[model samples]
Target chain A: ILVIRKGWLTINNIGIMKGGSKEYWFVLTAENLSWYKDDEEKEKKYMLSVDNLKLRDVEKGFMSSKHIFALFNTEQRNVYKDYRQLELACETQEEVDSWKASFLRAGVYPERV
Target chain B: ILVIRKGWLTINNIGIMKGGSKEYWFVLTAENLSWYKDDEEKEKKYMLSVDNLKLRDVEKGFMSSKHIFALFNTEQRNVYKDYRQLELACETQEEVDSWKASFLRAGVYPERV
Candidate 1:
């Protein structure tokens, strides 16, 4: 898939280790959202298919900032066993809005929103 | 514990999704190395205890460059099953050397280096 946008972002595990955060190089492609460690080889990457994405709001006060969103990989059938939730943080409201808009355009979010 | 150094770093899963990489903000503390998404609140993060870290080399030509290292979380216990290895990249040889030195000082690597 062609890449739409790519940049650095923070990701936190909402399940196993809730308090840890890591920076990742995220590449948003036409059909998927992929990421890699900033220091890793570029060709090696992880991905969450856009078609299986489910975006939702994070709990209030869950983080120190309000510019946050939760992403779920619904294709992981064992949702009950694993939350598969990724909490993402943006630097500003503009970036947050931009990401939400991109996810919508990519068809990752529900059509309703 | 006091933070020793903190900065942006890329992390790639060398096991399940070998090609996937993501950018994360890394914090090196006296007792651990933690990371989070660039946008996430600083207070929330993920960590690997320094006492259980293992550093190794990447197979030649695995990536586009030579300044890369592999970090393993030995505490995972399920090494055979999980292969909790993280492939990290740095911008330059200086950064690679700096990171290596930092990990050494953190007591993550063997004393012999």
Candidate 2:
């Protein structure tokens, strides 16, 4: 089960129920903005988002220890940290459509479906 | 005139013909990848590209000095510096189509138009 909670860092927690064991995964994406000394008046900003996240079978077993790092690293960066949307995609279009319908029925994002 | 050169860093140089003096601008985008001790065998790579670049009027006057930094910083990161394509977009669809046609005529990409 993959649970995504949107708040400070847009925490993404994934758990796998394997035989006699449970594993987990964590991933984050954020933005950063800064300026230069020489160009004081002109404020330049860069919007960066980190993707390409994966979790190994073993790493999921020790999820408590491994999962914390993703959150810690995100705090260390201290970017704009404002997130407003979350999207979920599955392997097949049918799965995504089903999920979307469920979300709509549950009254999530009232106007958006 | 905006000149985009594809090589080391995929430099974009823009020069403005305003009044008696000429101004220029520079921008860069690159990728970064690293690993952690916990994840040794499982290698995770994040492909990042920086966009939303703008150059003020004064920045163009000192283009030579400011332009080199984009290249220098890209080198400092030591990311995979392989670039194979270039694209240009104009405000109007006609302009974009014209540019695409010219690029096609110039044999930029054999099969891509």
Candidate 3:
């Protein structure tokens, strides 16, 4: 996978698990996006491929006023199952726009399901 | 709580939950350090009070090369139990140093437990 951009981002309730949200350093690549607990690490513990990826805007009607987006992988054989859907909370609207643009550039457009 | 510094930081794990690390926007205050899944939200879902808070340095011998720090609350009445222990991974050494300094400024220091 060709690397596009990498930085820190917050994730809401990962892998269909029940808990509070936390921070992770993620790498955006042409084929997928991978994240790690540590920013400096080269290896990633989790990843989301661009193929069959779905995106949704959950900016309104939330407990908080933060701009939020949801991503899901539609691959049937995926190991994560329903937990593959991820709710990503960006720090700002500008960052959210940037990610959307990057996803477009990577040729992965999310069809709202 | 008096606000000190507010920004996004990666948390290794939260409340002793099992999962990959995620990024969160946190607020450091004089009385406690609080974090939210969404950065712009005023309400916080998790908080670590400075009173009876413990800190530890886990920089050496880990899975990754990133600088890592751990924080725990020593209060007996803590509702979180052992799940209160948190392993925080900073994006850089500078950030880790900054948090350490802020923790000291707020009168909370890790006693290497």
TM-scores of the models, in the given order? 0.43, 0.19, 0.45
Scored by lDDT, the top model is 3
Candidate 1: tens digits of C-alpha lDDT, residues A1-113: 67788877777553445456766788787786777655332232356667677777666435466567777666674322255566688767687778888887777683211
**Interface RMSD for every prediction, one decimal?**
10.0, 23.0, 12.0
Candidate with better TM-score, 1 vs 2? 1
Per-residue lDDT tens digits of candidate 3, residues B13-88?
5534545677777888888677766665423446666777777887552577567887777666342435656777
* Candidate-wise lDDT, in order: 0.63, 0.24, 0.69
Model 3 misplaced stretches (Cα beyond 4 Å)? A1-113, B15-19, B59-62, B75-81
| Cα lDDT tens digits for candidate 3, A1-113 | 57888877778655435356777787788877777666654234566667777677765425774578767666653324355467677768998888888877776576664
Candidate 2 wrongly placed segments (more than 4 Å)? A1-81, A109-113, B1-113
The superposed Cα distance between candidate 1 and the true structure at residue A71, in angstroms, equals 1.5
Docking class for model 3 is incorrect
Order the candidates by lDDT, highest first: 3, 1, 2
Q: What is the interface RMSD of candidate 3, in Å?
A: 12.0
Off by over 4 Å in 1: A14-19, A39-45, A61-63, A74-81, A110-113, B1-113
DockQ comparisons of all candidates to the true complex: 0.03, 0.01, 0.03
Q: By summed lDDT, which 10 consecutive residues of candidate 2 chain B come out lowest?
A: B63-72
Q: Global lDDT for candidate 3? A: 0.69
lDDT of 1: 0.63
